[PDB]
Amino acid sequence: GQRWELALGRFWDYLRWVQTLSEQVQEELLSSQVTQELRALMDETMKELKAYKSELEEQLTPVAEETRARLSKELQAAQARLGADMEDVCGRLVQYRGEVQAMLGQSTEELRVRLASHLRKLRKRLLRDADDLQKCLAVYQAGA
């Protein structure tokens, strides 16, 4: 369970609470809190993960540069997607803030079921490419 894994562990665990949309969620949701505590989650997972790839560059079992090239692209994009999705996820939580601060009272009720499946789609996305990241780091910690 790497520094990388426990981190996102926490992120994705927070994200599950946002996903519920109880009253404390929605109240963290119309101010600043959710996206920004989700920002400081997204970020520490990126850092520790950066941190682990940084380690494995010492443990490589070797082949000649056409591959030592590809070794970038494979991982770094995969990494980056994982980033990109948890950064675009805060997009959706900030455009919520908005579509409610649009509402002028009236009612989030319709919206919190919109908000909810678009979230569950996006979170299903973060999950896939974290799996795929789990995957590259491994054959990258192995050649194989």
**Annotated binding-site residue? 122:** yes
10 is in an annotated binding site: no
d(CA 110, CA 38): 24
- In this structure, the number of other CB atoms found within 10 A of the CB of residue 139 comes to 11
Q: Nearest 10 degrees: CA dihedral of 89, 40, 26, 86?
A: 10
C-alpha to C-alpha distance for 3 and 83, rounded to whole angstroms: 16
| Residue 123 is assigned to a ligand binding site | yes
Q: Which residues are annotated as a binding site for heparin?
A: 122-125
Q: Which residues are annotated as a binding site?
A: 122-125
